[PDB]
Design brief:
Elements (H helix, E strand, L loop, with lengths): L2 H9 L2 E6 L5 E4 L2 E4 L4 H12 L9 H21 L3 H7 L2 H18 L4 H8 L3 H9 L2 H5 L1 H13 L7
Antiparallel strand pairs: 1-2, 2-3
Helix pairs in contact: 3-5, 4-6, 5-9, 6-7, 7-9
Bound molecules: 1-iodo-4-methylbenzene (XQM) and chloride ion.
1-iodo-4-methylbenzene binds next to helix 4, helix 5 and helix 6.
PDB class: hydrolase
Keywords: RT, 4-iodotoluene, L99A, hydrolase
Assembly: monomeric
Length: about 160
């Protein structure tokens, strides 16, 4: 298992524009296009991202390239953030994947509310961090996804994905 296989399981693959769990236009392996309600705005964002007139549909190769770009961007966001980088650097490789997963889903701003969880993770208080992470809108809105990610933080294993 690696970060790409983990996120592919959590996000799935769709080659036509779809709506995510919050109702936002998305394509590929969880690539957010826009938070605007306008399908035309989403199609414009798609064409700009891919570099051709897609009319709302992409190829599997295109989805996989967007996905590589999005994972790279999540990692770079962690490394440039003075609050996230020291926590990330303290984690083992499996728990680092759980961190990337959360940033991929919620972005740097979405993780800003997890300040107490970050401190517990840096101190390697895994059970306490797991409870704190579950006290969140994230866990209440996408509980199965959150349970897999939290279990990965708690155990440092891939058991929730196997
Ligand atoms: C919630 C969370 C976000 C970033 C890191 I690094 C660890 C935990
Ligand atoms: Cl879920």
């Amino acid at each position: 298992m690696n970060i790409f296989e983990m996120l592919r399981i959590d996000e799935g693959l769709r080659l036509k524009i779809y709506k995510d769990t919050e109702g936002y236009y998305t394509i590929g392996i969880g690539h957010l296009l826009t938070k605007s309600p306008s399908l035309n705005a989403a199609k414009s964002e798609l064409d700009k991202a891919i570099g051709r007139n897609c009319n709302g549909v992409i190829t599997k190769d295109e989805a996989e390239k967007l996905f590589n770009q999005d994972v790279d961007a999540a990692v770079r966001g962690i490394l440039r953030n003075a609050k996230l980088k020291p926590v990330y650097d303290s984690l083992d490789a499996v728990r680092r994947c759980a961190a990337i997963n959360m940033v991929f889903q919620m972005g740097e701003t979405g993780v800003a509310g997890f300040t107490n969880s970050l401190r517990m993770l840096q101190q390697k208080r895994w059970d306490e961090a797991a409870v704190n992470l579950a006290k969140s809108r994230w866990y209440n809105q996408t509980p199965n996804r959150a349970k897999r990610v939290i279990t990965t933080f708690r155990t440092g294993t891939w058991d929730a994905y196997k």
